[PDB]
Motif scaffolding. Structure first.
Motif, PDB file in Angstrom:
ATOM      1  N   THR A  39     -15.563  24.562 -17.938  1.00  0.00           N
ATOM      2  CA  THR A  39     -15.855  25.135 -16.170  1.00  0.00           C
ATOM      3  C   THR A  39     -15.878  26.760 -16.082  1.00  0.00           C
ATOM      4  OG1 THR A  39     -13.935  23.750 -15.423  1.00  0.00           O
ATOM      5  CG2 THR A  39     -16.463  22.548 -15.526  1.00  0.00           C
ATOM      6  N   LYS A  42     -18.060  29.413 -17.247  1.00  0.00           N
ATOM      7  CA  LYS A  42     -19.511  28.933 -16.080  1.00  0.00           C
ATOM      8  C   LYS A  42     -18.896  30.280 -14.602  1.00  0.00           C
ATOM      9  CE  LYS A  42     -22.520  26.216 -17.783  1.00  0.00           C
ATOM     10  NZ  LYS A  42     -24.037  26.334 -18.084  1.00  0.00           N
ATOM     11  N   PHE A  43     -18.170  30.728 -14.539  1.00  0.00           N
ATOM     12  CA  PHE A  43     -17.618  32.599 -13.731  1.00  0.00           C
ATOM     13  C   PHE A  43     -17.529  33.644 -13.744  1.00  0.00           C
ATOM     14  CE2 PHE A  43     -17.400  29.516  -9.425  1.00  0.00           C
ATOM     15  CZ  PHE A  43     -17.374  28.306  -9.975  1.00  0.00           C
ATOM     16  N   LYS A  45     -16.314  35.728 -13.307  1.00  0.00           N
ATOM     17  CA  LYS A  45     -15.367  36.422 -12.317  1.00  0.00           C
ATOM     18  C   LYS A  45     -14.006  35.444 -12.052  1.00  0.00           C
ATOM     19  CE  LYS A  45     -16.335  34.832  -7.315  1.00  0.00           C
ATOM     20  NZ  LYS A  45     -16.084  34.667  -6.253  1.00  0.00           N
ATOM     21  N   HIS A  64     -12.584  31.981  -3.043  1.00  0.00           N
ATOM     22  CA  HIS A  64     -14.371  31.210  -3.542  1.00  0.00           C
ATOM     23  C   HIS A  64     -13.922  29.700  -3.167  1.00  0.00           C
ATOM     24  CE1 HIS A  64     -17.780  30.453  -5.335  1.00  0.00           C
ATOM     25  NE2 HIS A  64     -16.948  29.458  -6.185  1.00  0.00           N
ATOM     26  N   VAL A  67     -14.760  29.648   0.195  1.00  0.00           N
ATOM     27  CA  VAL A  67     -16.588  29.636   0.412  1.00  0.00           C
ATOM     28  C   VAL A  67     -16.761  27.894  -0.266  1.00  0.00           C
ATOM     29  CG1 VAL A  67     -18.718  30.233  -0.906  1.00  0.00           C
ATOM     30  CG2 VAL A  67     -16.774  31.895   0.053  1.00  0.00           C
ATOM     31  N   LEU A  72     -19.159  22.468   1.729  1.00  0.00           N
ATOM     32  CA  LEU A  72     -19.296  21.281   1.594  1.00  0.00           C
ATOM     33  C   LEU A  72     -19.187  20.477   3.032  1.00  0.00           C
ATOM     34  CD1 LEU A  72     -18.834  18.962  -0.135  1.00  0.00           C
ATOM     35  CD2 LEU A  72     -16.670  18.589  -0.895  1.00  0.00           C
ATOM     36  N   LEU A  89     -28.336  25.426  -2.066  1.00  0.00           N
ATOM     37  CA  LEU A  89     -27.420  24.781  -3.165  1.00  0.00           C
ATOM     38  C   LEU A  89     -27.294  24.272  -4.225  1.00  0.00           C
ATOM     39  CD1 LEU A  89     -24.182  24.191  -1.014  1.00  0.00           C
ATOM     40  CD2 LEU A  89     -24.700  26.409  -1.674  1.00  0.00           C
ATOM     41  N   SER A  92     -29.781  26.847  -6.103  1.00  0.00           N
ATOM     42  CA  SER A  92     -29.063  27.627  -7.117  1.00  0.00           C
ATOM     43  C   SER A  92     -28.106  27.615  -8.169  1.00  0.00           C
ATOM     44  CB  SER A  92     -27.756  28.945  -5.614  1.00  0.00           C
ATOM     45  OG  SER A  92     -26.786  27.838  -5.736  1.00  0.00           O
ATOM     46  N   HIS A  93     -27.461  26.098  -8.133  1.00  0.00           N
ATOM     47  CA  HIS A  93     -26.547  25.861  -9.071  1.00  0.00           C
ATOM     48  C   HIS A  93     -27.288  25.475 -10.190  1.00  0.00           C
ATOM     49  CE1 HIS A  93     -23.449  25.962  -6.358  1.00  0.00           C
ATOM     50  NE2 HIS A  93     -22.764  26.012  -6.873  1.00  0.00           N
ATOM     51  N   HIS A  97     -26.675  29.769 -11.510  1.00  0.00           N
ATOM     52  CA  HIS A  97     -25.374  29.246 -11.838  1.00  0.00           C
ATOM     53  C   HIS A  97     -25.598  28.178 -13.527  1.00  0.00           C
ATOM     54  CE1 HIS A  97     -24.962  31.357  -8.477  1.00  0.00           C
ATOM     55  NE2 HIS A  97     -24.820  30.334  -7.524  1.00  0.00           N
ATOM     56  N   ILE A  99     -25.755  25.241 -13.602  1.00  0.00           N
ATOM     57  CA  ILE A  99     -23.914  24.136 -13.571  1.00  0.00           C
ATOM     58  C   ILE A  99     -24.247  22.213 -13.950  1.00  0.00           C
ATOM     59  CG2 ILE A  99     -22.441  22.812 -12.298  1.00  0.00           C
ATOM     60  CD1 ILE A  99     -22.410  26.504 -13.011  1.00  0.00           C
ATOM     61  N   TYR A 103     -20.324  18.596 -13.798  1.00  0.00           N
ATOM     62  CA  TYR A 103     -19.420  19.346 -13.553  1.00  0.00           C
ATOM     63  C   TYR A 103     -19.626  19.332 -12.273  1.00  0.00           C
ATOM     64  CZ  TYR A 103     -19.869  22.150 -17.309  1.00  0.00           C
ATOM     65  OH  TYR A 103     -19.527  22.851 -19.150  1.00  0.00           O
ATOM     66  N   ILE A 107     -15.803  17.972 -10.068  1.00  0.00           N
ATOM     67  CA  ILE A 107     -15.305  18.441  -8.614  1.00  0.00           C
ATOM     68  C   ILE A 107     -14.867  17.416  -8.379  1.00  0.00           C
ATOM     69  CG2 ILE A 107     -17.149  19.225  -7.388  1.00  0.00           C
ATOM     70  CD1 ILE A 107     -15.686  22.417  -6.983  1.00  0.00           C
ATOM     71  N   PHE A 138     -23.343  13.147  -1.684  1.00  0.00           N
ATOM     72  CA  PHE A 138     -24.017  14.789  -1.886  1.00  0.00           C
ATOM     73  C   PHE A 138     -24.330  14.818  -3.545  1.00  0.00           C
ATOM     74  CE2 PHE A 138     -21.766  18.088  -3.518  1.00  0.00           C
ATOM     75  CZ  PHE A 138     -22.321  19.503  -3.102  1.00  0.00           C
TER      76      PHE A 138
HETATM   77  C1  HEM Z   1     -18.346  21.031  -4.546  1.00  0.00           C
HETATM   78  C2  HEM Z   1     -19.727  21.056  -4.422  1.00  0.00           C
HETATM   79  C3  HEM Z   1     -20.448  22.777  -4.840  1.00  0.00           C
HETATM   80  C4  HEM Z   1     -20.750  23.571  -3.643  1.00  0.00           C
HETATM   81  C5  HEM Z   1     -19.852  22.907  -2.347  1.00  0.00           C
HETATM   82  C6  HEM Z   1     -20.508  24.803  -4.106  1.00  0.00           C
HETATM   83  C7  HEM Z   1     -21.031  25.462  -3.666  1.00  0.00           C
HETATM   84  C8  HEM Z   1     -21.007  27.435  -3.717  1.00  0.00           C
HETATM   85  C9  HEM Z   1     -21.490  28.114  -2.782  1.00  0.00           C
HETATM   86  C10 HEM Z   1     -21.649  28.084  -1.431  1.00  0.00           C
HETATM   87  C11 HEM Z   1     -21.621  29.140  -3.531  1.00  0.00           C
HETATM   88  C12 HEM Z   1     -22.349  30.921  -3.185  1.00  0.00           C
HETATM   89  C13 HEM Z   1     -23.455  30.509  -2.861  1.00  0.00           C
HETATM   90  C14 HEM Z   1     -24.697  30.428  -4.184  1.00  0.00           C
HETATM   91  O1  HEM Z   1     -24.463  30.766  -5.101  1.00  0.00           O
HETATM   92  O2  HEM Z   1     -25.048  28.901  -3.752  1.00  0.00           O
HETATM   93  C15 HEM Z   1     -21.212  29.407  -5.170  1.00  0.00           C
HETATM   94  C16 HEM Z   1     -21.001  29.970  -6.001  1.00  0.00           C
HETATM   95  C17 HEM Z   1     -21.177  29.620  -7.271  1.00  0.00           C
HETATM   96  N1  HEM Z   1     -20.922  28.061  -7.501  1.00  0.00           N
HETATM   97 FE1  HEM Z   1     -20.378  26.508  -6.368  1.00  0.00          FE
HETATM   98  N2  HEM Z   1     -20.207  24.745  -5.138  1.00  0.00           N
HETATM   99  C18 HEM Z   1     -19.782  23.690  -6.260  1.00  0.00           C
HETATM  100  C19 HEM Z   1     -19.505  23.080  -7.411  1.00  0.00           C
HETATM  101  C20 HEM Z   1     -19.608  24.103  -8.214  1.00  0.00           C
HETATM  102  C21 HEM Z   1     -19.585  23.973  -9.802  1.00  0.00           C
HETATM  103  C22 HEM Z   1     -19.092  22.405  -9.999  1.00  0.00           C
HETATM  104  C23 HEM Z   1     -19.292  25.156 -10.464  1.00  0.00           C
HETATM  105  C24 HEM Z   1     -19.012  24.753 -12.289  1.00  0.00           C
HETATM  106  C25 HEM Z   1     -18.076  24.244 -12.345  1.00  0.00           C
HETATM  107  C26 HEM Z   1     -19.285  25.903  -9.483  1.00  0.00           C
HETATM  108  C27 HEM Z   1     -19.866  27.534  -9.865  1.00  0.00           C
HETATM  109  C28 HEM Z   1     -20.861  28.627  -9.317  1.00  0.00           C
HETATM  110  C29 HEM Z   1     -20.378  29.436  -9.188  1.00  0.00           C
HETATM  111  C30 HEM Z   1     -20.932  29.495 -10.881  1.00  0.00           C
HETATM  112  C31 HEM Z   1     -21.058  30.595  -8.316  1.00  0.00           C
HETATM  113  C32 HEM Z   1     -21.037  31.669  -8.298  1.00  0.00           C
HETATM  114  C33 HEM Z   1     -19.598  32.514  -8.233  1.00  0.00           C
HETATM  115  C34 HEM Z   1     -19.624  33.688  -8.071  1.00  0.00           C
HETATM  116  O3  HEM Z   1     -20.092  34.606  -8.963  1.00  0.00           O
HETATM  117  O4  HEM Z   1     -19.922  34.698  -6.862  1.00  0.00           O
HETATM  118  N3  HEM Z   1     -19.736  25.443  -8.689  1.00  0.00           N
HETATM  119  N4  HEM Z   1     -20.881  27.867  -4.768  1.00  0.00           N
END
Ligand code: HEM
Length: 152
Positions: A39, A42-43, A45, A64, A67, A72, A89, A92-93, A97, A99, A103, A107, A138
């Motif tokens: 996991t 995928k980031f 950063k 992060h 955020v 959530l 979301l 975007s995911h 991203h 995802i 994954y 989480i 969700f």
């Molecule tokens: C509870 C589940 C999650 C929530 C509510 C969540 C929420 C968010 C939010 C609000 C953003 C920023 C806005 C956007 O890009 O849409 C974000 C960015 C991101 N999310 Fe998620 N996310 C979740 C789970 C995950 C998981 C499981 C992964 C990867 C294993 C992930 C990977 C990312 C990545 C790669 C970014 C971009 C980070 C950046 O470079 O700044 N997310 N997520």
């Protein structure tokens, strides 16, 4: 689909998270990254983080986590009426991203783990049941949007 009493449990548990959103968010991400190192890839950063100590010291990782958990919490407070909040979301995911739904399962289980770790003896069986169902809802609504998009 959750009953009113189940939503009440979810939002009661969420009050524990809101008292320290950054500490909970940090630990959720560390549990995800250390339990499932794929996991981290995928980031862009966070991929530089090699050890958990670096993860714990990272202020951007805590940011992060804030955020993620803020998003959530906003969804959970809708008690299932979250189409408008969930659609961006999901989009975007899946499209930016990339995802996999797996994954999001990881989480979800990490959130349950962290709640027991930070509140041992204070996260009862009924509260775990209701929180798990809320995270399943969700994930399931995200999965429906993933299928629409053909994303695996
Ligand atoms: C509870 C589940 C999650 C929530 C509510 C969540 C929420 C968010 C939010 C609000 C953003 C920023 C806005 C956007 O890009 O849409 C974000 C960015 C991101 N999310 Fe998620 N996310 C979740 C789970 C995950 C998981 C499981 C992964 C990867 C294993 C992930 C990977 C990312 C990545 C790669 C970014 C971009 C980070 C950046 O470079 O700044 N997310 N997520």
């Amino acid at each position: 689909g959750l009953s009113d009493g189940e939503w009440q449990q979810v939002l009661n548990v969420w009050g524990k998270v809101e008292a320290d959103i950054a500490g909970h968010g940090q630990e959720v991400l560390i549990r995800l990254f250390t339990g499932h190192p794929e996991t981290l890839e995928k980031f862009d950063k966070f991929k530089h983080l090699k050890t958990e100590a670096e993860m714990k010291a990272s202020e951007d990782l805590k940011k992060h986590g804030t955020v993620v958990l803020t998003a959530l919490g906003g969804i959970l407070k809708k008690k299932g009426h979250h189409e408008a909040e969930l659609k961006p979301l999901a989009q975007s995911h899946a499209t930016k991203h990339k995802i996999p739904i797996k994954y999001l399962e990881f989480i979800s289980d990490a959130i349950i783990h962290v709640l027991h770790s930070k509140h041992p003896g204070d996260f009862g069986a009924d509260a775990q049941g209701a929180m798990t169902k809320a995270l399943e809802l969700f994930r399931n609504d995200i999965a429906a949007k993933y299928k629409e998009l053909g994303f695996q």
